Amino acid sequence: ANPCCSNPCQNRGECMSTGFDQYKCDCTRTGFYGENCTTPEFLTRIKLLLKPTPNTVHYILTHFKGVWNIVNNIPFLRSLIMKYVLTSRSYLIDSPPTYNVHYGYKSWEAFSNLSYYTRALPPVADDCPTPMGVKGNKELPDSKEVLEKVLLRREFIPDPQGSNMMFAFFAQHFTHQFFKTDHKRGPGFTRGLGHGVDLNHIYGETLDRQHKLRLFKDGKLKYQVIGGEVYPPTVKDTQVEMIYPPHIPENLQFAVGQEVFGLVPGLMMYATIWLREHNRVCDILKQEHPEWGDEQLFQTSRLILIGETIKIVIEDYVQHLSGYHFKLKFDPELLFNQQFQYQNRIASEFNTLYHWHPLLPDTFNIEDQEYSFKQFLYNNSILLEHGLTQFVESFTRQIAGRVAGGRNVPIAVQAVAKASIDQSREMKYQSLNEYRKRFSLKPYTSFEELTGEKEMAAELKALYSDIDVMELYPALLVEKPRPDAIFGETMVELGAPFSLKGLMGNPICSPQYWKPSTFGGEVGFKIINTASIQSLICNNVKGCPFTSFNVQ
Amino acid sequence: ANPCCSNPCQNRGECMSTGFDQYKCDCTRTGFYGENCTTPEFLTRIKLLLKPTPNTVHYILTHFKGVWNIVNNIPFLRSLIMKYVLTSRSYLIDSPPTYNVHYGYKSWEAFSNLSYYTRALPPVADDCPTPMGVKGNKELPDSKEVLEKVLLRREFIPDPQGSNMMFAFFAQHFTHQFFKTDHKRGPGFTRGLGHGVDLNHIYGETLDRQHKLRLFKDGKLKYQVIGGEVYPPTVKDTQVEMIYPPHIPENLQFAVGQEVFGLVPGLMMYATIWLREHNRVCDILKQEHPEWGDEQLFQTSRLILIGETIKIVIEDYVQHLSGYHFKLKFDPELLFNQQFQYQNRIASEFNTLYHWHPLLPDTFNIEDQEYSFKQFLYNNSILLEHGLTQFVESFTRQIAGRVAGGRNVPIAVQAVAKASIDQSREMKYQSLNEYRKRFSLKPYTSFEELTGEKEMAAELKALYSDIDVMELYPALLVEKPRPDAIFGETMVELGAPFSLKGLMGNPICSPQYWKPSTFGGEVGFKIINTASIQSLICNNVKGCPFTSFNVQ
Ligand code: HEM
Ligand code: HEM
Ligand SMILES: *[C@@H]1O[C@H](CO)[C@@H](O[C@@H]2O[C@H](CO)[C@@H](O)[C@H](O)[C@H]2NC(C)=O)[C@H](O)[C@H]1NC(C)=O
Ligand SMILES: *[C@@H]1O[C@H](CO)[C@@H](O[C@@H]2O[C@H](CO)[C@@H](O)[C@H](O)[C@H]2NC(C)=O)[C@H](O)[C@H]1NC(C)=O
Ligand SMILES: CC(C)COc1c(Cl)cc2c(c1Cl)O[C@@H](C(F)(F)F)C(C(=O)O)=C2
Ligand SMILES: CC(C)COc1c(Cl)cc2c(c1Cl)O[C@@H](C(F)(F)F)C(C(=O)O)=C2
Ligand SMILES: CCCCCCCCO[C@@H]1O[C@H](CO)[C@@H](O)[C@H](O)[C@H]1O
Ligand SMILES: *[C@@H]1O[C@H](CO)[C@@H](O)[C@H](O)[C@H]1NC(C)=O
Ligand SMILES: *[C@@H]1O[C@H](CO)[C@@H](O)[C@H](O)[C@H]1NC(C)=O
């Protein structure tokens, strides 16, 4: 009965009920006017005629390698291009943030309460006749049916971009500092109150936890030595809370910032590497600053490791995921003459789209061995047995799975894919197509257009009946990929805005933070500005093994 | 010890030790270079020649009323001037914030921990030889001596700008939503985690307190009716905690957003007015929106009151306080094509400069009664006896004290004035002249330049010896006022940047919030954009008594 249930306002206009069964669209600064904000203003008409499609842009960015080679070596051109991607991407995000799972209208509660994930689109009102608003049936199709018919792996589909397991575990490790759903509260709530790249997954969310992880000598984090190699310390040494099944022996209960990182040896690999990187940066800072005390060594190192992280995420991780020949750049100076909000609130939909469980192989391959899921999970003896070097060498060789294209979620994790479907519904997400318009994409007109084939498309039609009723999460995993690419259109177009805002929103990117003295001088500043996935592994893993995010 | 103890880096350069006995300045984006950032850039030399002093500017803005009359009646110019004041003042504030009482260098802890007040200048480090760095004696002069010789009132000195008790109590009430020192932790800590104009003093800091204060019908706040007049509910009725001495009867224990507001009838006056205003806007929104539930009516009203609050503070309060003939304007649209961070962190120094107790008279005059402090404190009987209409009429007629100029702190509050001095020192504040530099002011070269007279200057010179050792807080209350002004230069030049950033940094001012739909349509939007202290009183106080921030 809520008259805004049909989601009638278009082009980012805001709907508001003006009576028990009438509505009004606020078209302020949409660039359109009219009842539904669909009548464009002159300048908008021109802008929309000169805007190429995302797929048009993807082609140009993934072809003409010789030209981009030249462009990449003309700094002012490279800077101009990257400046434009940063600002044009980021305008797609609401900042300061607006809606959440409980608020489909702006409120001081939705603004102020940091425990919520925010919402790119408001939730469908409780009193709407259907789950998606007014379209479709009274109930969405059975999530188990959806799961089994179009999401579950039959045969492993390797990523055509050649993403490796160093990449898969990096994505998991990196994102789990800002994806930390509070299950005590509900799926639309977070325990990552920093809402960004604060490295709480290394240092801990709270000061108490951080202080138990710290050595209070030379700015360092506690560690232990086992077989001559540096690993994180134990729960017994540090007294910090971790999630471990009851049978894990005390000596293998490792303590790190993130409480769930001891449950996957690939996560524990990165926790070790970064802890190692933190202590290494303390030694460099102490060399430069014998006057400095423990506190400042610790704090400055943390700032540097945050910079290293954003640097690597942009120039290696996103570089690889995008497939672009254009050389992406981490340079905060790009935004200083530009309008940008140095803040971020993590979006629920960003959490949802980052569920890339199809990346996971059917087995994990370290040296001679091939480990099943049951063997791999909660099992840090494997890390100790093989060591980091072999972990890196092995995971650099092992191909990850393709994410879009359908039917490639491993069964070992099928409950996690079911919960993604079920919790999107619980949180009253709007439909795939509503989210496509939200990020200026053309709605799909059929399931065949979505999938780019006929079989999964036909199964989806039998379940959903109407393309307008298709759900975001399953669409992302079933969408037609770009040519020989890991993702489809929707993943990139919603993902790129959330991601870059979170990276460039950090306070260290603000002009008052982004200078040498923030990071202990030019030596500290250089560490950020020369950081790479290769150098991270080379400085902290014995024998400086080669590494990359793609299978070589 | 620390080589940065002498504050060597000028012009906002940042100082960093580079060894036990050496420093380096980071001159990044200061407009200067050289060892101490004192060598101006070509472009910088030009601006320093063309830039007039704040006093030259103050004269212009407070004279030529005929010329201002015309400017004020030309929308585009008025807007253009107000745009410039906003942007030019806001660039004085670090945003994202930087330092706090425990961190004199940037750290994630000082960024992320919302329980600190931030700092416009870092603290003087613990190992410095003197309180101010290196200058002065090993101890600052006895605070009691400073207080007695130059701060305490002999004879009430009236504000020549004619500020009244309506103004004085608006200031206390408004500011006490964001100045809420957490004495459990210490003077450098706040309970006002919203760090701005969130109206927690009406609605409560925590969800639990808000809920106790809410009626849960039609978006309203609980109230009671005494003698046909609306007042806040009691502690007993709502179980919300208030600070009252034990002898206060239960029927006078009023429960409002801010726990300390029962301490003064003047605060409770405004608490009643604003409670009435919230419930008034609920009625307005209920009329327009019969479809709406209690949550939305409550949330939407709060966003309108925050709007009303910012409107009145700029166009009534700051207008009066500035003494300007130019007509200031609350218009978020002014910043949309400018660079501006929609966030704020409340500074310790802003709290310190806002200790305007010289405003208080020796007795509070209502109707025909002259109440002493003892009689007035924690005495809501006074409010119920006289009523709101009489309070407004009385407080409108009673003049407040001048703040700068010296010797006007009421003796009844001397322990508060001594504390401001003692806490500044505990928080390791830099000197008056450092703060002047920080805010583009010329350092004072004698106590006579500071005071504009000889007697207090000489008292001050015997106590402090060096002008460079002089403290911020006492200086503000002894400073030579502008001609017939309530304040001296330093108060305005530090206070304006902090004030306007807090106002405009609110998210309701951001592009995506500032549209009709946020406030329930044009009718609610209109409530913000026509608000005034007069209309606040007229809509909510019986008989629509005339009011103003100045004596008639
Ligand atoms: C390596 C084996 C992995 C296992 C066993 C695993 C398993 C899980 C589990 C059990 C959950 C919690 C589900 C729930 O409580 O509803 C989860 C959530 C999640 N997974 Fe994975 N996952 C793996 C790898 C990955 C990878 C490579 C990614 C790629 C980024 C990823 C992304 C996510 C995200 C973003 C969440 C939401 C977490 C939160 O919000 O707290 N996972 N996964
Ligand atoms: C009406 C009579 C007033 C009394 C009895 C009074 C008394 C006090 C006291 C006792 C404190 C210390 C609070 C504490 O340490 O917990 C204080 C602080 C303060 N006063 Fe007043 N004051 C009055 C009026 C005003 C006025 C008119 C202003 C002008 C804005 C003002 C501004 C402040 C500020 C900004 C603080 C610091 C608050 C904090 O850090 O939480 N006061 N006052
Ligand atoms: C942020 O929002 C959540 C949801 O309203 C608040 O959590 C609830 O608080 C109430 C009352 O204090 C409890 O009865 C609920 O059980 C809480 N949880 C949930 C899931 O409803 C939370 O307190 C808010 N946080 C802040 C800091 O205001
Ligand atoms: C912000 O900083 C303060 C001060 O460091 C923290 O307050 C202290 O917390 C510890 C517990 O970890 C106590 O032992 C102290 O007594 C606390 N108070 C003070 C005044 O030191 C506070 O925990 C921090 N807040 C956050 C969110 O980290
Ligand atoms: C979570 C995933 C989707 C994010 O990883 C990506 C991917 Cl896969 C693509 C782009 C992107 C990011 Cl961040 O951001 C930008 C880029 F690469 F140019 F910076 C972009 C563009 O075309 O503007 C495309
Ligand atoms: C906390 C107190 C000090 C704030 O009250 C003031 C005062 Cl007293 C003066 C100005 C000011 C504010 Cl806010 O801000 C601006 C104004 F008036 F133009 F908006 C200003 C200017 O010259 O730019 C001067
Ligand atoms: C009483 C009108 C003249 C004011 C003179 C102020 C000089 C400071 O005198 C001080 O006054 C304080 C408050 O009364 C007392 O507590 C101190 O004992 C006294 O030294
Ligand atoms: C874990 O791996 C180690 C080393 O291979 C070994 O103790 C055991 O086979 C594994 N445990 C489980 C439960 O698979
Ligand atoms: C409070 O004010 C009343 C008038 O309402 C007055 O009669 C009374 O004596 C005052 N109380 C105290 C404790 O001074």
Side-chain angles (χ1 to χ4, degrees):
Chain A
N2 191 310
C4 289
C5 287
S6 71
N7 309 300
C9 309
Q10 307 299 308
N11 304 309
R12 305 268 260 127
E14 299 168 9
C15 191
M16 183 194 67
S17 57
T18 67
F20 279 107
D21 277 317
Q22 323 91 312
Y23 70 90
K24 163 70 167 174
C25 291
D26 192 351
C27 299
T28 304
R29 274 172 270 100
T30 60
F32 298 79
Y33 60 109
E35 178 177 32
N36 298 317
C37 305
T38 72
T39 306
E41 301 178 321
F42 189 83
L43 168 47
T44 310
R45 308 205 74 185
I46 278 71
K47 280 198 175 173
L48 290 154
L49 270 57
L50 270 31
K51 192 180 166 80
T53 53
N55 290 343
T56 288
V57 173
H58 184 267
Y59 184 103
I60 293 180
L61 267 283
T62 60
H63 293 83
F64 315 121
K65 182 160 202 192
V67 181
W68 292 113
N69 235 150
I70 294 169
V71 169
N72 290 340
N73 289 299
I74 307 175
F76 107 89
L77 246 178
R78 191 180 167 202
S79 293
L80 188 172
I81 298 297
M82 196 72 187
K83 180 184 282 152
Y84 173 78
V85 327
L86 262 19
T87 56
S88 75
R89 250 48 237 217
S90 292
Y91 96 91
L92 270 290
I93 305 312
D94 280 348
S95 192
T98 63
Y99 311 105
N100 68 34
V101 70
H102 289 152
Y103 291 92
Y105 54 82
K106 293 171 236 95
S107 68
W108 193 261
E109 176 68 19
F111 166 70
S112 51
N113 190 330
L114 298 183
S115 289
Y116 284 92
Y117 288 115
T118 192
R119 286 282 280 275
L121 279 179
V124 170
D126 294 335
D127 71 277
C128 299
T130 72
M132 287 309 186
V134 300
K135 290 154 163 192
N137 298 307
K138 302 291 166 44
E139 280 221 306
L140 265 17
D142 186 279
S143 54
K144 190 174 179 75
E145 234 82 302
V146 182
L147 185 282
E148 288 189 336
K149 286 202 165 75
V150 306
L151 298 183
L152 290 191
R153 177 174 294 167
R154 336 271 121 155
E155 162 145 26
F156 179 60
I157 298 180
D159 177 25
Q161 286 179 235
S163 298
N164 60 21
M165 288 310 298
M166 289 299 287
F167 171 90
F169 287 117
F170 192 94
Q172 192 183 15
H173 189 269
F174 168 63
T175 64
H176 281 43
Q177 79 195 279
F178 48 75
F179 303 142
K180 299 199 287 176
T181 300
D182 201 338
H183 301 288
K184 310 202 158 177
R185 290 181 188 284
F189 296 91
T190 186
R191 310 166 62 191
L193 303 191
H195 277 275
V197 185
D198 62 4
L199 306 202
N200 80 80
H201 66 326
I202 294 160
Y203 303 109
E205 264 293 311
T206 68
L207 186 58
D208 233 276
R209 189 182 184 82
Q210 183 205 108
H211 285 193
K212 290 169 178 184
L213 287 171
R214 270 179 66 192
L215 178 67
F216 295 105
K217 284 183 182 201
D218 298 327
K220 301 197 183 184
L221 272 37
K222 291 169 177 152
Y223 65 91
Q224 62 184 314
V225 172
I226 307 163
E229 293 279 311
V230 164
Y231 291 94
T234 57
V235 162
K236 188 188 188 190
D237 173 23
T238 60
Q239 234 64 62
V240 308
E241 298 190 322
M242 301 286 293
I243 293 173
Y244 280 110
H247 70 274
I248 303 304
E250 283 190 301
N251 77 279
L252 307 174
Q253 293 174 31
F254 296 88
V256 294
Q258 238 282 22
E259 51 164 28
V260 307
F261 278 10
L263 298 186
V264 189
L267 257 37
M268 199 48 63
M269 181 202 196
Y270 274 111
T272 309
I273 286 175
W274 281 110
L275 179 152
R276 275 143 88 145
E277 176 59 22
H278 173 86
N279 287 354
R280 178 203 157 251
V281 169
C282 289
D283 289 334
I284 292 161
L285 283 173
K286 187 172 193 62
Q287 188 113 84
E288 295 319 298
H289 295 301
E291 351 65 82
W292 280 14
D294 175 69
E295 241 332 266
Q296 181 166 199
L297 281 159
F298 167 83
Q299 298 291 343
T300 313
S301 285
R302 174 172 199 172
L303 291 184
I304 287 162
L305 272 74
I306 289 170
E308 282 192 74
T309 303
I310 298 156
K311 169 74 171 185
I312 289 174
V313 175
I314 292 184
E315 298 195 18
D316 291 310
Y317 179 92
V318 169
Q319 191 65 55
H320 161 70
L321 228 24
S322 75
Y324 293 171
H325 290 138
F326 170 69
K327 193 172 192 172
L328 302 169
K329 184 164 76 142
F330 175 46
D331 187 10
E333 291 187 41
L334 292 171
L335 296 167
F336 296 169
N337 70 348
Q338 230 47 41
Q339 282 172 322
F340 191 79
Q341 297 302 305
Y342 295 104
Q343 51 170 292
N344 197 46
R345 190 83 91 256
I346 299 296
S348 181
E349 301 101 330
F350 187 39
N351 186 312
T352 295
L353 73 75
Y354 232 118
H355 287 239
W356 297 344
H357 297 99
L359 287 171
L360 303 174
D362 290 332
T363 66
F364 301 90
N365 294 343
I366 311 167
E367 208 175 320
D368 297 3
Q369 311 275 22
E370 302 187 355
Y371 298 102
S372 79
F373 272 80
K374 204 278 187 82
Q375 298 163 357
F376 200 60
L377 292 193
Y378 338 113
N379 202 1
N380 299 328
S381 276
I382 297 168
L383 189 60
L384 293 186
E385 168 88 337
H386 294 283
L388 270 283
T389 301
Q390 191 64 233
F391 252 63
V392 164
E393 291 177 340
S394 290
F395 284 153
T396 297
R397 293 196 302 274
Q398 187 171 357
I399 189 128
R402 194 187 217 172
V403 181
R407 284 178 181 167
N408 203 35
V409 177
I411 257 193
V413 96
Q414 67 172 307
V416 188
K418 186 157 194 298
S420 288
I421 300 169
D422 292 337
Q423 292 171 340
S424 301
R425 300 173 174 187
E426 199 195 310
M427 296 188 295
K428 302 296 306 293
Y429 277 29
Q430 286 180 45
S431 70
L432 170 65
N433 270 342
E434 298 303 333
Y435 278 104
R436 282 180 61 80
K437 282 135 80 201
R438 174 51 240 262
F439 291 84
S440 313
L441 310 178
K442 190 198 72 165
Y444 289 112
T445 70
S446 74
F447 290 91
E448 296 200 335
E449 205 189 33
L450 172 51
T451 67
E453 49 79 80
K454 316 194 169 185
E455 178 164 295
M456 291 184 289
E459 297 301 341
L460 289 167
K461 176 163 250 198
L463 293 171
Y464 287 90
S465 315
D466 187 355
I467 188 61
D468 292 316
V469 183
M470 185 57 191
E471 295 171 82
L472 184 59
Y473 167 76
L476 295 166
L477 295 192
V478 144
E479 190 174 31
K480 185 194 168 175
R482 266 58 174 285
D484 308 305
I486 196 176
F487 299 140
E489 173 178 28
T490 313
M491 188 73 72
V492 181
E493 292 297 296
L494 315 205
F498 292 134
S499 175
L500 289 161
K501 233 309 226 188
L503 272 13
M504 302 307 298
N506 200 278
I508 74 156
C509 301
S510 69
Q512 278 296 66
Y513 277 70
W514 185 254
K515 44 176 90 162
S517 49
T518 303
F519 314 103
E522 296 289 347
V523 176
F525 199 39
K526 188 188 208 297
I527 292 179
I528 296 167
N529 287 310
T530 62
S532 63
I533 187 62
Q534 177 61 86
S535 79
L536 179 72
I537 279 58
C538 187
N539 289 337
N540 302 302
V541 183
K542 185 181 169 146
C544 180
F546 172 72
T547 200
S548 152
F549 284 147
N550 61 91
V551 155
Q552 71 268 110
Chain B
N2 189 330
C4 289
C5 282
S6 68
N7 305 302
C9 313
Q10 306 303 306
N11 299 297
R12 312 263 269 128
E14 292 177 24
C15 194
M16 178 193 84
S17 59
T18 65
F20 291 97
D21 304 288
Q22 328 108 221
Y23 67 99
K24 161 163 179 191
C25 296
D26 187 337
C27 302
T28 298
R29 290 161 225 113
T30 61
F32 296 80
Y33 56 98
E35 181 181 47
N36 297 329
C37 312
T38 39
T39 303
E41 291 166 34
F42 171 54
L43 200 91
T44 307
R45 305 184 73 188
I46 263 57
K47 295 172 177 184
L48 286 187
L49 269 54
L50 271 57
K51 183 171 165 82
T53 65
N55 285 1
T56 300
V57 174
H58 184 274
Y59 182 94
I60 294 168
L61 277 285
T62 54
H63 291 79
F64 312 102
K65 192 194 185 202
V67 172
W68 285 116
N69 221 65
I70 295 171
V71 167
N72 290 339
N73 288 316
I74 298 170
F76 98 78
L77 247 190
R78 189 194 172 199
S79 289
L80 219 157
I81 298 291
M82 194 71 205
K83 177 176 264 183
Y84 168 77
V85 297
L86 267 31
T87 60
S88 77
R89 241 65 184 192
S90 299
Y91 89 86
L92 278 300
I93 308 308
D94 287 345
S95 191
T98 51
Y99 311 110
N100 73 28
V101 63
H102 290 151
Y103 295 92
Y105 52 85
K106 295 175 226 105
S107 62
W108 190 262
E109 176 64 16
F111 168 71
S112 58
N113 189 329
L114 298 191
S115 294
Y116 286 94
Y117 291 113
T118 192
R119 281 281 276 274
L121 287 174
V124 176
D126 297 343
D127 61 352
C128 297
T130 70
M132 292 303 177
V134 298
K135 293 179 167 191
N137 294 314
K138 296 293 171 78
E139 267 164 13
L140 263 26
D142 185 355
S143 53
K144 165 170 146 69
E145 227 74 39
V146 172
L147 206 234
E148 289 180 355
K149 291 186 154 66
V150 309
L151 302 178
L152 293 187
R153 176 179 291 163
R154 339 277 112 161
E155 184 165 342
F156 179 75
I157 289 169
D159 173 32
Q161 285 185 233
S163 302
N164 58 16
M165 292 315 289
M166 286 294 293
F167 173 80
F169 286 119
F170 190 89
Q172 193 184 7
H173 180 264
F174 169 68
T175 60
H176 279 42
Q177 80 198 274
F178 48 71
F179 302 142
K180 306 204 299 183
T181 304
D182 191 354
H183 294 285
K184 291 164 210 174
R185 299 188 189 269
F189 292 90
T190 183
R191 301 167 64 157
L193 304 194
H195 279 271
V197 188
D198 58 1
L199 303 202
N200 69 79
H201 64 328
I202 294 164
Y203 299 113
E205 264 295 304
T206 62
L207 219 204
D208 200 76
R209 185 172 180 88
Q210 189 208 116
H211 283 186
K212 288 161 152 184
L213 290 160
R214 282 174 60 182
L215 190 59
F216 292 110
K217 285 212 147 190
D218 304 334
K220 289 167 173 190
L221 252 17
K222 281 170 177 163
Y223 61 101
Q224 52 174 350
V225 183
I226 304 162
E229 297 280 314
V230 166
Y231 289 96
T234 62
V235 163
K236 185 196 151 216
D237 283 330
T238 60
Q239 284 78 49
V240 337
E241 307 196 6
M242 297 293 303
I243 306 184
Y244 283 114
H247 69 263
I248 282 298
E250 296 182 333
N251 56 13
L252 294 168
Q253 294 192 14
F254 289 120
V256 291
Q258 229 282 30
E259 61 172 71
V260 80
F261 275 9
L263 219 303
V264 197
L267 264 10
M268 199 57 65
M269 181 192 145
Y270 277 115
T272 294
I273 287 174
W274 275 113
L275 179 162
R276 277 141 79 152
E277 175 57 23
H278 177 95
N279 287 354
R280 191 195 132 250
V281 172
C282 287
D283 287 335
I284 289 183
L285 290 176
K286 180 166 201 69
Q287 176 69 210
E288 299 304 318
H289 296 289
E291 342 74 90
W292 274 15
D294 164 78
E295 231 342 76
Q296 188 159 201
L297 288 161
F298 164 81
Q299 295 295 339
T300 309
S301 305
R302 169 176 202 169
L303 294 182
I304 288 160
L305 267 63
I306 289 164
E308 291 195 76
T309 300
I310 295 167
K311 175 73 170 186
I312 298 170
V313 172
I314 299 173
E315 295 189 21
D316 296 300
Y317 174 92
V318 169
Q319 180 66 60
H320 158 73
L321 212 36
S322 69
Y324 292 168
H325 296 132
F326 173 60
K327 194 189 183 160
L328 304 163
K329 182 162 84 147
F330 174 52
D331 187 4
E333 287 200 303
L334 295 176
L335 294 174
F336 293 174
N337 57 26
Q338 234 53 22
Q339 284 180 309
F340 188 79
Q341 297 299 310
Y342 293 104
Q343 54 182 278
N344 191 46
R345 191 76 58 89
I346 297 291
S348 189
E349 300 94 340
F350 193 37
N351 186 313
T352 301
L353 76 92
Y354 236 119
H355 290 239
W356 298 344
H357 300 110
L359 291 167
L360 299 170
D362 294 314
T363 70
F364 304 83
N365 305 359
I366 299 160
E367 200 160 349
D368 297 305
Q369 314 281 290
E370 271 170 27
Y371 300 106
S372 67
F373 271 75
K374 213 259 175 52
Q375 292 174 323
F376 201 63
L377 294 194
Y378 0 86
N379 199 346
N380 293 324
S381 321
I382 300 171
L383 184 65
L384 296 184
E385 138 140 84
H386 291 292
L388 258 289
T389 306
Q390 195 61 192
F391 256 66
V392 181
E393 290 179 337
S394 292
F395 284 175
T396 295
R397 284 194 314 264
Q398 179 172 17
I399 198 171
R402 193 185 218 170
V403 175
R407 299 184 169 167
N408 210 42
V409 175
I411 293 176
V413 82
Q414 70 170 335
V416 181
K418 193 193 188 281
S420 299
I421 292 171
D422 286 340
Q423 282 160 346
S424 305
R425 297 171 176 182
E426 186 199 322
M427 292 191 285
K428 308 302 300 309
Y429 272 31
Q430 295 188 44
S431 74
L432 169 62
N433 283 346
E434 291 308 319
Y435 280 101
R436 283 178 69 81
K437 277 138 96 192
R438 172 58 259 265
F439 287 87
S440 305
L441 305 175
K442 213 172 67 176
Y444 285 126
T445 43
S446 60
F447 295 93
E448 298 201 1
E449 201 184 349
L450 165 64
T451 63
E453 52 77 80
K454 304 200 173 221
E455 187 168 304
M456 299 188 300
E459 295 264 66
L460 283 161
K461 168 159 263 221
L463 285 181
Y464 287 88
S465 311
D466 195 347
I467 185 56
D468 294 326
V469 173
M470 182 59 191
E471 303 176 79
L472 178 53
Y473 164 74
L476 285 161
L477 308 187
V478 293
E479 193 172 38
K480 191 191 165 172
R482 263 66 174 271
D484 303 325
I486 198 175
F487 297 142
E489 177 190 12
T490 310
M491 184 78 75
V492 171
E493 291 302 307
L494 309 219
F498 291 128
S499 166
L500 297 163
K501 224 293 170 151
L503 271 5
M504 299 310 296
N506 191 289
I508 72 138
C509 297
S510 65
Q512 290 285 61
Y513 278 75
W514 186 253
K515 41 176 90 169
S517 40
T518 303
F519 314 104
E522 298 269 43
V523 176
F525 200 40
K526 191 170 189 296
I527 296 168
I528 297 176
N529 289 319
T530 59
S532 65
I533 190 59
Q534 179 62 87
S535 76
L536 179 65
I537 279 57
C538 192
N539 296 328
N540 294 308
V541 182
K542 186 173 210 182
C544 179
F546 166 90
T547 203
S548 163
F549 286 143
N550 57 79
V551 162
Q552 299 294 313

